[PDB]
Amino acid sequence: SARIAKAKKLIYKLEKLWNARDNDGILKLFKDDAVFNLNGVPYKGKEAIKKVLESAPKAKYKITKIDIKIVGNEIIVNVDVLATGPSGFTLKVKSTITFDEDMKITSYEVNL
Numbered sequence: 403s404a405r406i407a408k409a410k411k412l413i414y415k416l417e418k419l420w421n422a423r424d425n426d427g428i429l430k431l432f433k434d435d436a437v438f439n440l441n442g443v444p445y446k447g448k449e450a451i452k453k454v455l456e457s458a459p460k461a462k463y464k465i466t467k468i469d470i471k472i473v474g475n476e477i478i479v480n481v482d483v484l485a486t487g488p489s490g491f492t493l494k495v496k497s498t499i500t501f502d503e504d505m506k507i508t509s510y511e512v513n514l
């Protein structure tokens with residue numbers, strides 16, 4: 403409950419971060435050696451993640467469903483997202499975001 407809502411606040415904070423392309427603000431939510439799994443392709447380290455952030459399309463995202471799981475000291479969050487692209491094509495995407503005990507992102511899978 404406590405860790406659930408805090409994780410939820412982080413997700414909705416991430417939605418605004420993604421739409422404003424606040425890539426610095428996004429990276430601050432990560433661990434240094436976290437992995438951004440972009441469609442089966444992992445990017446370990448904040449240097450490879452910042453690139454993933456900058457190469458992302460100019461998209462608008464809307465959350466449509468949050469699934470929070472407690473696997474101990476880690477919270478695994480599944481989020482359904484409506485991804486609207488730069489030319490109006492709306493696509494259903496999904497993210498699997500894992501937080502550690504200090505609410506830092508250790509893994510961030512996005513599957514399309």
Ligand SMILES: COc1ccc(-n2nc(C(N)=O)c3c2C(=O)N(c2ccc(N4CCCCC4=O)cc2)CC3)cc1
Pocket residue numbers: 413414416417418420440454457458459461463464465481483485486487488491492493495496497512514
């Ligand atoms: C219109 O259709 C698309 C298709 C693909 C892409 N596309 N491309 C890339 C890439 N080639 O890098 C990425 C994405 C994407 O959808 N990404 C993302 C997914 C979901 C979230 N959200 C939302 C808020 C809170 C939770 C959360 O995780 C944030 C960013 C980043 C990566 C965009 C649009």
